[PDB]
Symmetry: C2
Subunit: 121 residues, 2 copies
């Protein structure tokens, strides 16, 4: 088991600003496997869902590799292993509106949490 301590919440920011989407987690004793973190986006302005935007796996970050939000979504912490899977989305666009899901796995534990993002003109 594994818990994401951030609550599901709605972040509202203005176009062109930076959105911080928190995702902080704690581990249970059996979570001894490799830390794996992913974020997915389900945008409001298209019917595509669960698209990967960022991944931490094998102690490497893959961010711009994923086309959605390329160049604009990055992990905020310099130590993800300390329990901080949060991300920043820079230069917010109206197309960024949607539901973002943080997925944290440290085998065998798994947890997920959704953050809703609204961008204001």
């Amino acid at each position: 088991s594994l818990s994401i301590t951030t609550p599901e919440e709605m972040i509202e920011k203005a176009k062109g600003e930076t959105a911080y989407l928190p995702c902080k987690f704690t581990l249970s004793p059996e979570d001894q496997g490799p830390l794996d973190i992913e974020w997915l986006i389900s945008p409001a302005d298209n019917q595509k869902v669960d698209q990967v935007i960022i991944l931490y796996s094998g102690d490497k970050i893959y961010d711009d590799y994923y086309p959605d939000l390329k160049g604009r979504v990055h992990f905020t912490s310099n130590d993800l292993k300390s329990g901080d899977a949060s991300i920043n989305v820079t230069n917010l666009q109206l197309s960024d509106i949607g539901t973002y899901q943080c997925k944290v796995k440290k085998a065998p534990g798994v947890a997920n949490k959704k953050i809703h993002l609204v961008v204001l003109v």
Copy 2:
């Protein structure tokens, strides 16, 4: 090599009778950039409940976690003795009608990710 991480026949239905063993295939192919650690997860969305995406088995850090997950505990296991060769398949033994649902095979070898869905039908 494939152009991107790929699973053979990514959406299909498997049908078996109650009490039999179902073989749920998930055969994958890597692309040249998939250099991270292999990770494989299967999830169930049962037809008899509102729960979706419940983990039933995981291969991560070269370890298998199966009965650790309560759904189908004791009855779902990987079939291959060499998952790294491309065989992420699982079998479900002594099938029950409550096993009916959508099973998802998720294969990750960073940065590649691929998914497959199997609709499992159990016949009386």
